Design a protein around this ligand. Structure first.
Ligand SMILES: NC[C@@H]1O[C@H](O[C@H]2[C@@H](O)[C@H](O[C@@H]3[C@@H](O)[C@H](N)C[C@H](N)[C@H]3O[C@H]3O[C@H](CO)[C@@H](O)[C@H](O)[C@H]3N)O[C@@H]2CO)[C@H](N)[C@@H](O)[C@@H]1O
Ligand SMILES: [K+]
Ligand SMILES: [K+]
Ligand SMILES: [K+]
Ligand SMILES: [K+]
Ligand SMILES: [K+]
Ligand SMILES: [K+]
Ligand SMILES: [K+]
Ligand SMILES: [K+]
Ligand SMILES: [Mg+2]
Ligand SMILES: [Mg+2]
Ligand SMILES: [Mg+2]
Ligand SMILES: [Mg+2]
Ligand SMILES: [Mg+2]
Ligand SMILES: [Mg+2]
Ligand SMILES: [Mg+2]
Ligand SMILES: [Mg+2]
Ligand SMILES: [Mg+2]
Ligand SMILES: [Mg+2]
Ligand SMILES: [Mg+2]
Ligand SMILES: [Mg+2]
Ligand SMILES: [Mg+2]
Ligand SMILES: [Mg+2]
Ligand SMILES: [Mg+2]
Ligand SMILES: [Mg+2]
Ligand SMILES: [Mg+2]
Ligand SMILES: [Mg+2]
Ligand SMILES: [Mg+2]
Ligand SMILES: [Mg+2]
Ligand SMILES: [Mg+2]
Ligand SMILES: [Mg+2]
Ligand SMILES: [Mg+2]
Ligand SMILES: [Mg+2]
Ligand SMILES: [Mg+2]
Ligand SMILES: [Mg+2]
Ligand SMILES: [Mg+2]
Ligand SMILES: [Mg+2]
Ligand SMILES: [Mg+2]
Ligand SMILES: [Mg+2]
Ligand code: NA
Ligand code: NA
Ligand code: NA
Ligand SMILES: [Zn+2]
Lengths: 50, 121, 160, 152, 81
RNA sequence: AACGUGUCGCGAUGGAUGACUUGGCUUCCUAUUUCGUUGAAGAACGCAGUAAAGUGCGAUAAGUGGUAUCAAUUGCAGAAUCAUUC
RNA sequence: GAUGUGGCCUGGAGGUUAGGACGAAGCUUAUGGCGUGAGCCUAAGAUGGACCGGCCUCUAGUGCAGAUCUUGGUUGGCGUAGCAAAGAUCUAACGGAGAUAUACUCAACAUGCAACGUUGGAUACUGGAGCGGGGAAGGAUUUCGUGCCAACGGCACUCGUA
RNA sequence: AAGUUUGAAAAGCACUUUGGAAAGAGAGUGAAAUAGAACCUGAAGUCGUGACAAAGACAAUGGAAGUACCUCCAUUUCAAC
């Protein structure tokens, strides 16, 4: 499993660098399921991406 | 179609680059002794729905109806002449028309015109 | 005339550790820098290229031509020479073989074959027929596929 | 790549081979030859101990200016190595041979290797770049490996 | 220095595509094709390169109209009665 | 001992040789046989149910029309007619 | 250096005489025999699959060991020289065929090594004249997502501008 | 540069088994698969393998004579011959 797409999308949405993007080490399955900016924003709201 | 000449190269090129309408004449088969006596014609170009008997090769003696004159592989397909594949399917086996004898002619108005014009009597 | 020489080839010189042969110019292709213009070089010109003004034909003295024809005719009247040449004339009645002039009136090949059988030239004819075979070598790829022996010659008084 | 030798008893033998392995021919040559007369289980144990670096593969022919080691003494040599890429390839081949013996109904515990042949396969071409704008070959040397074993 | 380093100094293009022949031989600054001499009315043709002539000669392309007119000439400009 | 050497049997690598030849080369001949502003040669871009190249073609685009021919094309698919012309 | 040779050999032509699916050409040889020799002939093929031999004459792009000869392939060197500028990586979990992969004996060490992609930690680097963010020239789909590891990224890849 | 020149016909190897895959081992087709796929024939050179021959260091090869061992070669002989 590679979360590169979600990390890239999170960086763009949060307007910060990759070092500032935190992708929950657990819930990798739920993060992997997010393939759109709308889904990534929901992950940010739920706290899986900080 | 006057393919044979003094040049083997030219004759072979004309044969193997012959158009489809010339390939039809090249893919002719002799008529049966019964049909030869009735029409006074020695041979006819094979066409679909003709009845033929194989005279040369492995399938010699087999009767069947012509299902295709492929004309690109210089073969005719006979419904009763076939074999089995590895997976059990049945595939037709191509036969050169000069190895078969036409036992029944699929008759059409232009086919009858050809038979009348080739009548040697 | 241009075969093997239609290239802008030049020698590289002696400074480079290669043979002093003209070489194909340019780069990017397999032939780049390959030997050229030589009879020893692949793709080069053949040694002494053939010309159409080679002496194909020959003059022969007219009397010598007539002498040769006369000698050939005289040899044809010797059955030992005819047999030595390879003809089967074992059953023919006489040499020279002279037949009547009525054969010029034949219209069917069947009658001609009957005449040949009657005068016993069919043995030589069958010799040619059994000798028909595919020519050995490249000549069969040329227009000389089939070879056979020479049979009897039937000489007419005219073109009829 | 047909088998150069035939087993004494065909019904009591198992065969296996691989073509264009993409392993170094010389290293694989040394690795496969050492198991030529060994029982199948002993060959598998040796390969595991080579991977553990407690035993080595003796380099008898293609050993020009390679290092020396004490683990080569058991083979009567002083030069040996641990070619893991060749070793794991050979262990896979032994597994296929054991599977063939099992399929034919033979006992792998009683199978003795009888034939081992390594051949130079067709070479794959790459290029390397040298000083003064020179291009020079950078070749890969794959190998053909064939073997069979018989019940003892 | 001349060689490798100077290879990186080569910027821009001397030649671009030619409208008439499409050989990338159109000199941008001089506004003329090195291959076919466009926009001069006539093309380049030199007997010291017959190979160049025969690359560009008639019959190397489609002969779109020449095929039609040759058939008409062979048929003596036949027309319906 | 081991490397190494030599021979034979069998394999690998490598594509010579023979057979094959719809190509080339060369020599003859025939003729209501010689392009274009009525836009040529050449260049470009497109066109197939499936289609990169090549070939053919030009938004009527692997072709429309007419004559002859007389049951196909064909890798798959599609297809009124199984046929005096339509 | 000259000359001679019912002297040898090769492609083709005119003649003649034969062979071949019960195996032609070609190819292979501790297959022998013959010839001072060039070479010829037979035997075997657990070789090949369709042409071809002898003799007289004619004819020519007619005989190779080497021209720093031409083209193609191979080869010892050789698993050798090396793959050392730009400092540096470690750890767990997950993912993956890429494992914790075992005849007998035997508790695990001494018999499956090495190397990976992602995420979270840790350590450090670039230090705004940046391995930062945008443009021209040049390139022209390298952009993005999914799949995928044959070949390619001179080690590796589950990664990639493949 | 490059003949796709497999075969008479794709009949182009179903199915089983091992392998992640490639492929291997079986099984089939075919007269032939060492005709398995850009596949007729498959030389030389080089290499692997099994069997055997031996061999110090005279670099190896070569010449002439024997001998030891081997020989799917040839020829002769087998009875008062
Ligand atoms: N035996 C020693 C060597 O034999 C070689 O030649 C051998 C081979 O070239 C030759 O060919 C053999 C053939 O005899 C034998 N009866 C059948 C075998 N197929 C052939 O072998 C051939 O085909 C096989 C594959 O089929 C390939 O692996 C092999 O490389 C190839 N040479 O057999 C010869 C043996 O007598 C060399 N002439 C020579 O270097 C040396 O004397
Ligand atoms: K020279
Ligand atoms: K050359
Ligand atoms: K102009
Ligand atoms: K020129
Ligand atoms: K010499
Ligand atoms: K080497
Ligand atoms: K973009
Ligand atoms: K690679
Ligand atoms: Mg030439
Ligand atoms: Mg020949
Ligand atoms: Mg060293
Ligand atoms: Mg060393
Ligand atoms: Mg370099
Ligand atoms: Mg450079
Ligand atoms: Mg300068
Ligand atoms: Mg400048
Ligand atoms: Mg300028
Ligand atoms: Mg300007
Ligand atoms: Mg296209
Ligand atoms: Mg329109
Ligand atoms: Mg019609
Ligand atoms: Mg010649
Ligand atoms: Mg030998
Ligand atoms: Mg010569
Ligand atoms: Mg030579
Ligand atoms: Mg080193
Ligand atoms: Mg190093
Ligand atoms: Mg360094
Ligand atoms: Mg260095
Ligand atoms: Mg273990
Ligand atoms: Mg491990
Ligand atoms: Mg710093
Ligand atoms: Mg910057
Ligand atoms: Mg990308
Ligand atoms: Mg690599
Ligand atoms: Mg064979
Ligand atoms: Mg001994
Ligand atoms: Mg001796
Ligand atoms: Na026939
Ligand atoms: Na060889
Ligand atoms: Na050998
Ligand atoms: Zn131009």
């Amino acid at each position: 499993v590679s979360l590169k797409l979600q990390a890239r999308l999170a960086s763009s949405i949060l307007g910060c660098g990759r070092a500032r993007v935190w992708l929950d080490p657990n819930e990798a399955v739920e993060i992997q399921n997010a393939n759109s900016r709308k889904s990534v924003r929901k992950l940010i709201k739920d706290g899986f991406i900080i | 179609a006057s393919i044979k000449c003094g040049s083997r190269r030219k004759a072979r090129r004309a044969h193997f680059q012959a158009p489809s309408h010339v390939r039809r004449v090249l893919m002719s088969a002799p008529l049966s002794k019964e049909l030869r006596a009735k029409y006074n014609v020695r041979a006819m170009p094979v066409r679909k729905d003709d009845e033929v008997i194989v005279k040369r090769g492995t399938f010699k003696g087999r009767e069947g109806k012509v299902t295709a004159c492929y004309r690109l592989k210089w073969v005719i397909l006979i419904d009763k002449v076939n074999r089995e594949k590895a997976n059990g399917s049945t595939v037709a086996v191509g036969i050169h028309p000069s190895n078969v004898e036409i036992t029944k002619l699929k008759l059409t108005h232009h086919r009858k015109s050809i038979l009348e014009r080739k009548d040697r009597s | 005339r241009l075969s093997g020489m239609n290239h802008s080839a030049h020698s590289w010189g002696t400074g480079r550790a290669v043979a002093r042969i003209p070489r194909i110019s340019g780069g990017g292709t397999s032939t780049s820098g390959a030997g050229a213009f030589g009879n020893m070089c692949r793709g080069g010109r053949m040694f002494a290229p053939t010309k159409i003004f080679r002496r194909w034909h020959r003059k022969i003295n007219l009397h010598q031509k007539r002498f040769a024809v006369v000698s050939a005719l005289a040899a044809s009247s010797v059955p030992s020479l005819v047999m030595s040449r390879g003809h089967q004339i074992g059953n023919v009645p006489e040499v020279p073989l002279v037949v009547e002039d009525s054969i010029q009136g034949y219209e069917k090949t069947k009658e001609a074959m009957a005449f040949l059988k009657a005068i016993a030239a069919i043995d030589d004819v069958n010799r040619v027929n059994d000798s028909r075979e595919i020519r050995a070598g490249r000549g069969k790829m040329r227009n000389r596929r089939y070879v056979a022996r020479r049979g009897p010659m039937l000489v007419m008084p005219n073109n009829k | 790549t047909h088998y150069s030798r035939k087993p004494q008893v065909s019904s009591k033998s198992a065969k296996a081979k691989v073509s264009d392995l993409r392993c170094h021919y010389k290293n694989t040559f040394e690795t496969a030859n050492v198991i030529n007369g060994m029982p199948l289980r002993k060959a598998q144990q040796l390969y595991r101990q080579v991977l553990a670096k407690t035993r080595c593969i003796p380099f008898k022919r293609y050993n020009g200016k390679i290092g020396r080691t004490a683990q080569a003494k058991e083979w009567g040599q002083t030069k040996g190595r641990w070619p893991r890429k060749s070793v794991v390839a050979m262990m896979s081949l032994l597994k296929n041979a054991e599977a063939n013996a099992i399929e034919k109904g033979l006992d792998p515990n009683q199978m003795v290797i009888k034939h081992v042949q390594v051949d130079q396969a067709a070479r794959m071409r790459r290029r390397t770049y040298r000083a003064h704008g020179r291009i020079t070959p950078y070749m890969c040397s794959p190998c053909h490996v064939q073997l069979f074993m018989s019940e003892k | 220095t001349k060689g490798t380093t100077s290879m990186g100094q080569r910027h821009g293009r001397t030649h671009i595509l030619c409208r008439r022949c499409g050989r990338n031989s159109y000199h941008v600054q001089w506004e003329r094709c090195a291959a076919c001499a466009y926009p001069r009315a006539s093309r380049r043709r030199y007997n010291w390169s017959v190979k160049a002539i025969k690359r560009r000669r008639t019959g190397t392309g489609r002969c779109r109209y020449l095929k039609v007119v040759n058939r008409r000439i062979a048929n003596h400009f036949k027309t319906p009665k």
